[PDB]
Design a protein around this ligand. Structure first.
Ligand SMILES: *[C@@H]1O[C@H](CO)[C@@H](O)[C@H](O)[C@H]1NC(C)=O
Ligand SMILES: *[C@@H]1O[C@H](CO)[C@@H](O)[C@H](O)[C@H]1NC(C)=O
Lengths: 171, 221, 108, 222, 108, 171, 222, 221
């Protein structure tokens, strides 16, 4: 299928693109395309953020209107199906380089040299405790801003990424 | 720029009968990507802004009854009102709004209703004493709720047929009973108003067995 | 062409079961959209020349006489999803992330 | 829900620039649409699309009247402005402020604003009562109304008993006289059984002259 | 870059163990060359963001709290080998067959 | 690496190629290339079959000579490493479309329509016995001549492929 | 192991075609090589590559003598043929049948075959004994030999006691005389203590005339 | 066609001393694909076919001792025999055999050995009585195992220096002791042979304190 959405970019100068327009995003014959818009409410004075295409997503299924369902968040977001369905939108809540030490690199003084970053982490397992350090490239760091690999869960495992030389050592 | 041409200009069909209008476009309105036609059908009643009836050629809008339907393809489209009603009397416009910039409208096709004859109720109003203090005489004759629209009004002062001194005004078809109203005004000079006695309005219409005449006399309570 | 199963159908053949991921449940407020998305997961057994994406699987199964490492159910097709989030300096980022949703399950 | 309000001057001298502002209600301009549109309807003719503009600034003047029109927006004032240079009497018309859509066509419209092009100064209306025919058949029907004479330019809006009496109301189109002034008659039919019972007031509003009159019509005794 | 193990090294991490296939042992005389070739096989466990070829693996592991279907060790790279054999009508065929030898092992 | 071998094709007329020559076969930077030759002995009168390139193979490792090690087979084969090492060779043995029924296609009368072939097979398992029928395309049939999927092992499982309509039914 | 045998005419008339066949042993021609080669060595000069040919038929004549040479193979007879048209005396030389290789260069060679271009008929050799110096010092050394006079063309192969006596053997190059005939001398040194003990036979072979002589050399008494 | 030029023509070094030969090519012999040089070094002893010593510029062949080594690159190559031996006396040829068709040879560089002086052992042989029946006289003089190669032979019959009636033949350097042999033949007419009495051969060489003379008399057992 083929889908044309309204495209808008607020950070269009730094990113060097058109401020507003309409784009056509070719899709996959196996999945479906959507349109999306994002804006800040802030006391009735609406400021645009980003409009455009939005690949398949289970939440935008069967929605001809772009209505933010979130319960009063900072940045409002909505999506919809069909050509140009992001032309309008409203808010209606729902009622429902560097070098480090990698613990499996003893071949070279337990070291590395990735362009991305390096991590260290562990938890209580195999009885007592463990220890893990490693380094991963820039590509594997996804998303760009906040690589998940650098995130943890409060309840057990901790995690930390870092960029400086040899920062992934001991807790 | 996708010229628009509706057809016909006027249309007169009886209550509960089918009405159909056709508009042609010079360029194809079909869109290849999503296989759709960017055409719109609008209704406009007197004094009101146009109201969108149909978009996407055949898709109806929320709150629009079922008697309205759109159809067609490419460069020929049709709009059918099944079982016309008196509230559906209006002018109708065919528009195209595809992505191409120039959005153009049709010529406007009025829909009219066919109805049983109706003789007008005829009244007359002498000039109010308030405007008879500023050198003005306004003698009014009102024909009300009649059909067909063809009607004649002859003014007569002291049995003198007036000519070129009267102005007529007519309303559009009623949305409750499909009739017409007509107001005629004789603009006379206060001086001439005092100079004469009997003022009369004579109406002639199909529904009248004989020309009707409503008259009064200058200054008789 | 892989087979897409659901909680309803039962048996243990390499198949795509549904599984929804929810970032909000993790506590990740820096993700604006999607607060929750469709991930899915593969489950089942791989036996007797079934959805063998590569001949090596069948040849290493007939290679062995109920040895240890039989074939397992791994996803065989990935698709991307979009994301609207904040980055380190709290700049708004719209990105396309591949390798998030599985589309088929297969054997190797 | 959304409401499109519009407003203009009403009268314009010949061969001068014209302007119209279109306020918005129940919906932020940056939201609830991508395009916005100006249309006009000559006196008794069809429709003609003047132009449209996205809330980002880009405009698409109709090629028919291009190079004389100027159209802009203001998201801080929730507004939307139209400008039309070197006007002629052909430009006299009712201008509509609508929202152009790329899925539903122009779906919502405004209440319209009448703009006349004439080198004649404004005038206020005179309101006279057309007293009910003192000979009425006390069981049948009695007709009454009020006349609005000598105003310029269009429009005058008439209502009866503050919109509380609307059944059997006929307001005619304004007639133009030799002196370039407008006359108009509003009439109503009522049961003669209430002539000395129900009061009947006609409310004329001529905004171009800020003239609001509420005139009562009463019979005359013998 | 996957890790290539051998019978010597031990532990259960997703790794490429050696495994030689022999057609003659099956009794397939119609194969002229190779009478026996190098196939290899993957074995091991997949835990804690190890050789995750796709983010979906880590996200579906943190998705769950020791649920059932963890990641498994599947081959992640295939290479072809040549063959000189007889066909149905006993005509000599020289062919290149992809998907016969595994080059890396990974997790999903 | 890059490798140039002596190329020879006996069935060069039907296959429409050069009878003899030298070819250069670009390789993969991760693996190694070989050369190979194949001939029929038949009482001292040597007849060529096929010479050319031979992708990585654990048997041709570290062999500058092309020597058939097989123990008196019908068709002699040898390979070697290094450019042109198939220029010579000797023998020295070693001292060491259609439609069928697929059992999981009940959606369409338990049927299919592959361009390749269809199979049926089973063995004693899950206690008693089973039954499996299926159809697979022309691509998955590998090698061209003898698709393995159509082969079995005498000891338990049997196998049969077939081309005719509805031939993969009952044992 | 492999052995490259060669054979030719030996003598060739001027301005006529020449031919040479090269049999093979201990290795099938289609096997144990891709190329095969013909080289020649003029009388006392260097080497010159005549040509090569793959067992599939394709030939590569040396650009120097191209358009006069013809070279072919025969895998059914394990053979390998060379042909050279319009011969001159410059073409007189020792032709070598070798195997050209694309890894080891020409690794194996043949025993060579001498080809002469002359408009003179063949002749057989005469073998004369150079009796040992009857004055020998009965403790020192005695020299003897045999002379091969008046043969044509080259070569004659000399051996002593059937290759059983080779220490102290000197066979000189053949000298060419006024009559266009060849002379050659073979000599050997021996202990004088065996003059009446060990027998000494020189074996001359001139194949172009099928002349094999085994001549015994003996002293002369006083 | 990759012209070949060896250097020098002759080479004379003493036993156990180092010998080095250099050949230049007009075109580069290096091959870019496998980073190799298709050059060959061959040895040829008298009467034997050439024998390949080195291939691939610096790779030695099975059964070839270590004293032989090849080196060089591009268009300049060298072959060194460390510690020459008398069996290694021969001619040596530099060849190129890259894939390009024309395979060319060098000019041929002979290797010679330097040795202590050696006076020849001189013998003479009168004509056999078997050839003295066919009108032929062949008087032979043999110089054996001498060094250097420069040697002089004067024939004398009845004390008459012969001239233009004798033919000399010389062997190549010995592979056991590095010396030379020489055979001179006087081809005389049977009639003239009967006409004279004393036949003598006079040798002059560096290793001789005085010219040596071996003679005999016609018909004296
Ligand atoms: C923004 O917030 C106001 C109330 O806070 C709400 O009425 C409106 O619908 C929201 N969304 C808009 C204006 O797009
Ligand atoms: C073919 O067979 C013969 C004996 O049967 C053997 O000597 C020879 O080496 C074999 N291979 C060849 C000729 O290439």
């Amino acid at each position: 299928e083929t889908r044309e959405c309204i495209y808008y970019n607020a950070n269009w100068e730094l990113e060097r693109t058109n401020q507003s327009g309409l784009e056509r995003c070719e899709g996959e014959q196996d999945k479906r395309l959507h349109c999306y818009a994002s804006w800040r409410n802030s006391s009735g004075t609406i400021e645009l953020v980003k409009k455009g295409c939005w690949l398949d997503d289970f939440n935008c299924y069967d929605r001809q209107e772009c209505v933010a369902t979130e319960e009063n968040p900072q940045v409002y977001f909505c999506c919809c199906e069909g050509n140009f369905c992001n032309e309008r939108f409203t808010h209606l809540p729902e009622a429902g380089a560097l070098l480090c030490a990698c613990t499996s690199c003893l071949q070279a003084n337990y070291t590395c040299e990735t362009d991305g970053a390096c991590m260290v982490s562990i938890f209580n397992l195999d009885g007592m405790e463990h220890h893990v350090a490693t380094c991963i490239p820039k590509v594997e760091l996804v998303p760009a801003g906040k690589p998940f690999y650098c995130l943890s869960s409060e309840d057990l495992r901790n995690t930390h990424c870092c960029y400086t030389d040899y920062c992934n050592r001991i807790d | 720029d996708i010229v628009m041409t509706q057809s016909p200009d006027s249309l007169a069909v009886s209550l509960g009968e089918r009405a159909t209008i056709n508009c042609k476009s010079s360029q194809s309105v079909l869109y290849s990507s999503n296989n759709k036609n960017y055409l719109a059908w609008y209704q406009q009643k007197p004094g009101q802004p146009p109201k969108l009836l149909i978009y996407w050629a055949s898709t109806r809008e929320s709150g629009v009854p079922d008697r309205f339907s759109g159809s067609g393809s490419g460069t020929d489209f049709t709009l059918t009102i099944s079982s016309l009603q008196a509230e559906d009397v209006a002018v109708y416009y065919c528009q195209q709004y595809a992505l191409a910039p120039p959005r153009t409208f049709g010529g406007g096709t009025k829909v009219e209703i066919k109805r049983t004859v109706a003789a007008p109720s005829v009244f007359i109003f002498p000039p109010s004493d308030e405007q008879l203090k500023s050198g003005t005489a306004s003698v009014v004759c009102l024909l009300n709720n009649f059909y067909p629209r063809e009607a004649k009004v002859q003014w007569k002062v002291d049995n003198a047929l007036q000519s070129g001194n009267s102005q007529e005004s007519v309303t559009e078809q009623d949305s409750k009973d499909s009739t017409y109203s007509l107001s005629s005004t004789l603009t006379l000079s206060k001086a001439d108003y005092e100079k004469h006695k009997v003022y009369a309005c004579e109406v002639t219409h199909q529904g009248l067995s004989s020309p009707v005449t409503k008259s009064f006399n200058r200054g008789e309570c | 062409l892989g087979l897409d199963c659901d909680e309803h159908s039962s048996e243990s053949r390499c198949c795509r079961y549904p599984l929804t991921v929810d970032f909000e449940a993790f506590g990740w407020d820096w993700i604006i959209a999607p607060k929750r998305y469709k991930a899915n997961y593969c489950s089942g057994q791989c036996e007797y020349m079934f959805m063998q994406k590569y001949p090596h699987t069948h040849l290493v199964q007939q290679a062995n006489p109920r040895g240890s490492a039989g074939p397992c159910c791994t996803p065989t097709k990935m698709s991307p999803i979009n994301m609207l989030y904040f980055n380190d300096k709290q700049q708004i980022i719209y990105g396309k992330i591949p390798g998030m949703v599985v589309d088929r399950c297969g054997c190797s | 829900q959304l409401q499109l309000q519009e407003s203009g001057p009403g009268l314009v001298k010949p061969s001068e620039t014209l302007s119209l502002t279109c306020t918005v209600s129940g919906g932020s301009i940056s939201s609830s649409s991508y395009y916005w549109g100006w249309i006009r309807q000559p006196p008794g003719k069809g429709l003609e699309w003047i132009g449209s503009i996205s809330y980002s600034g880009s405009t698409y003047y109709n090629p028919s009247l291009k190079s004389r029109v100027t159209i802009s927006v203001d998201t801080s004032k929730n507004q939307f402005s139209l400008k039309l240079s070197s006007v002629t009497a052909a430009d006299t018309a009712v201008y509509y402020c609508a929202r152009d859509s790329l899925r539903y066509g122009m779906d919502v419209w405004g209440q319209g604003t009448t703009v006349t092009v004439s080198s004649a100064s404004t005038k206020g209306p005179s309101v006279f009562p057309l007293a009910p025919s003192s000979k009425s058949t006390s069981g049948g029907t009695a007709a009454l109304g009020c006349l609005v004479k000598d105003y310029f330019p269009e429009p005058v809006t008439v209502s009866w008993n503050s919109g509380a009496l609307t059944s059997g109301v006929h307001t005619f189109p304004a007639v133009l006289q030799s002196s370039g002034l407008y006359s108009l008659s509003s009439v109503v039919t009522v049961p003669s059984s209430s002539l000395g019972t129900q009061t009947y007031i006609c409310n004329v509003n001529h905004k171009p002259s800020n003239t609001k009159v509420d005139k009562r019509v009463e019979p005359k005794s013998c």
